[PDB]
RNA sequence: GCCCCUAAGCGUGUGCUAAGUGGAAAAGGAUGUGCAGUCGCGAAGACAACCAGGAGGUUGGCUUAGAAGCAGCCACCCUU
RNA sequence: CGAUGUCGGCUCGUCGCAUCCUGGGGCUGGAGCAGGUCCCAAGGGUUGGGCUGUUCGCCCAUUAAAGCGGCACGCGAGCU
Ligand SMILES: [Mg+2]
């Protein structure tokens with residue numbers, strides 16, 4: 001999990017969603033997992 | 038279920054056939070001897086072989102015509118293809134050799150007419166950077 | 171695809187139907203392009219094997235009294251015209267279907283009539 | 297929306313009722329009730345079906361339409377057919393068996409871990425590595441399935457642990 | 473070649489000035505002035521949306537026909553004032569034209585085609601001006617760059633023109649310059 | 665690293681950040697450009713960094729123009745010094761940038777990498793900027 | 801700098817009309 | 824300024840906000856939402872899902888240990 | 904400026920978390936042991952000596968750890 005002010009879809013399998021008022025990036029690759037904070 | 042391109046005159050190669058044949062349960066020696074017999078009868082160029090497998094580990098070899106690229110190389114007289122196709126031309130082929138290879142590709146291919154194989158070989162020569170004339 | 175390309179297709183199929191005495195509709199479900207290449211080899215020498223939009227052939231069928239074949243277009247449709255004779259395509263199709271077990275003989279068209287599978291097989295037996 | 301506009305068909309063997317917003321469905325497998333969101337109107341189609349309707353078009357109603365339809369479909373399916381999910385265990389020395397109604401696992405710990413059976417859920421182990429979790433409610437089935445699935449931390453090297461039926465986990469290589 | 477004039481409705485300005493023009497622009501209109509060989513400046517206001525549509529469709533020098541309280545007047549867009557930030561149109565100068573009148577107007581030059589892979593195409597003059605009959609101003613001029621090798625200059629005199637249009641600016645005005653593609657190392661010393 | 669060959673006066677009042685730009689507001693040499701949307705002094709180190717970034721993302725082809733030259737000097741006093749005792753010594757070179765000014769200019773075959781290089785340059789500048797093109 | 805920030809932002813009241821002594 | 828402290832409106836009409844934003848802040852990140860405007864495709868059936876395919880030539884050549892549609896360069900074609 | 908005692912140490916604390924230990928996790932170029940990095944968390948704990956006025960630092964033995972800061976660089980009508 002990467003927590004940065006900037007989150008982006010690193011690859012083509014990354015999806016940008018919003019959970020509980022936070023922008024997250026969820027991917028099948030765990031490295032690409034990141035949230036905004 | 039694998040296919041390979043391999044020299045006619047020698048069996049048991051190091052790079053291409055060894056490991057791929059091994060990881061499929063095919064007997065190396067019997068295939069080597071049968072292929073060597075067939076390729077000594079052939080004695081033209083290297084030949085491509087397809088490997089078909091069964092549940093009883095029996096192996097069947099599928100021997101096609103000599104490769105079109107190699108036939109064009111022998112027809113143009115050069116050994117190695119042009120490093121910059123369409124930018125430097127190493128050799129030129131008349132329609133007799135192209136049409137002989139077209140008959141070869143007709144025998145090995147799905148083409149309905151020899152003209153289709155002729156244009157196929159012309160495209161191959163374009164890919165190599167070899168003029169067809 | 172565009173409207174102009176579609177209309178060119180309609181004209182092409184209309185002229186192909188005008189140029190053939192008979193036409194047979196079958197199924198190509200679960201067929202590999204290798205099998206299609208073999209069928210093209212065995213047919214294009216004498217017959218013509220084609221596939222298109224069912225609705226586009228529906229628009230191509232409004233010319234002559236062949237609007238009754240619309241019911242036979244439910245599912246994949248493979249069009250086999252007979253430029254030479256009228257039954258060689260039917261026999262080749264039936265043998266291909268028996269060999270592959272994947273082609274269901276959807277129907278045919280003879281003498282301005284739409285026939286069933288049994289009638290088409292009987293005509294091929296003739 | 298598109299989910300919300302497709303009504304659910306109701307087989308013959310299931311009893312339904314509508315009491316205001318509340319809805320109850322009785323079938324061969326048991327009784328299960330539901331209460332739906334206020335903006336959404338639920339009905340009984342006379343042709344043997346259930347029709348859901350959103351009188352408005354705003355985001356909230358447009359979202360609840362599909363959710364309500366899918367919950368209704370799940371409700372009818374749960375009583376008509378029932379839900380079941382199977383698991384396989386991987387790894388050497390990993391087993392499972394029924395201690396009566398409960399589940400006992402052998403996952404390498406110094407103690408055997410026992411999983412209680414909540415109400416409405418019944419297990420059935422057939423092989424010491426393969427078993428299945430069955431139940432009438434999809435939500436409960438999924439919950440107990442997930443709890444059982446998390447009994448061991450993910451193992452990308454050997455793959456030891458509890459898996460779903462067709463799950464393909466990710467694996468890597470520890471060369472040393 | 474002829475272009476059908478685009479119909480537009482213009483109203484004479486009751487009040488002219490900075491505040492009046494600001495108000496008119498706030499109502500989605502565009503103030504403009506109409507003058508010509510008749511020597512009679514008329515102050516108008518045009519709808520911004522339809523004027524913008526006309527300009528977008530037919531370039532920056534579009535023939536217009538203006539309905540001014542029932543009178544039809546032919547006009548040509550002489551100049552446009554554009555705010556550099558908001559990119560809207562603030563003012564337009566409309567020139568009075570009649571059939572059979574020669575005007576001198578900029579016309580954009582765009583290039584098409586594909587040159588040698590080892591060359592870079594550079595356009596020096598964005599627009600060129602020509603003498604043409606007011607009703608037959610070409611929408612654009614095009615230069616084809618195909619099979620062009622290494623350093624080759626395409627100048628104004630080498631530009632193909634339609635029938636009845638005359639190039640007034642000198643032919644030596646370089647419009648498109650084709651040069652060898654700068655190497656990866658040649659980009660590290662330009663600008664330092 | 666751009667520095668003027670000489671200046672008539674080494675110490676100058678600060679450039680004024682008033683109004684919007686009146687010259688160089690349109691793309692003229694290349695196909696795409698970077699336009700400023702703020703007022704800011706832009707130093708030659710920032711220009712160097714942006715130019716290097718565009719060159720790196722563009723690789724072989726393409727040509728880059730810099731319509732902005734840092735000819736205005738800024739001075740700073742030596743550290744730990746009280747106020748007074750004259751003006752500082754010139755040790756920055758900046759160029760005054762108003763909104764509407766087109767700073768950089770690019771001419772490249774493909775739109776995607778053209779815009780990507782321009783964005784890479786923009787992220788190195790101290791201003792809000794946008795990419796503009798020749799067509800109206 | 802919270803104290804100075806609070807004072808200078810308190811300048812922005814409706815009653816002060818955007819100006820205050822010591823800003 | 825007008826819910827109560829605290830004098831006077833839990834005023835009227837039409838919309839917006841879900842953040843207690845209102846009741847502090849930057850570069851930048853982001854399928855939040857309302858409005859207005861352009862362009863693409865679509866009942867001759869669009870997009871998503873699903874099923875069946877998605878070949879042969881040929882492993883196109885240079886190049887290497889290797890090159891097989893996918894270290895790297897080139898052109899980049901033909902039949903169904 | 905008709906006086907607001909100033910560095911270290913002692914005694915006594917109290918608060919913040921930007922966490923040193925213990926506690927909970929995500930990703931690892933995480934096999935295991937042990938780590939690296941990021942997120943959560945302030946309940947308690949956080950040693951004794953050599954040198955130097957020293958803060959600091961270096962060193963010697965340990966320890967789970969030998970945290971970083973504010974409080975007139977806390978504390979002289981409490982001491983030196
Ligand atoms: Mg910036």
Ligand SMILES: [Zn+2]
Pocket residue numbers: 009010011012013014026027028029032
């Ligand atoms: Zn990803």
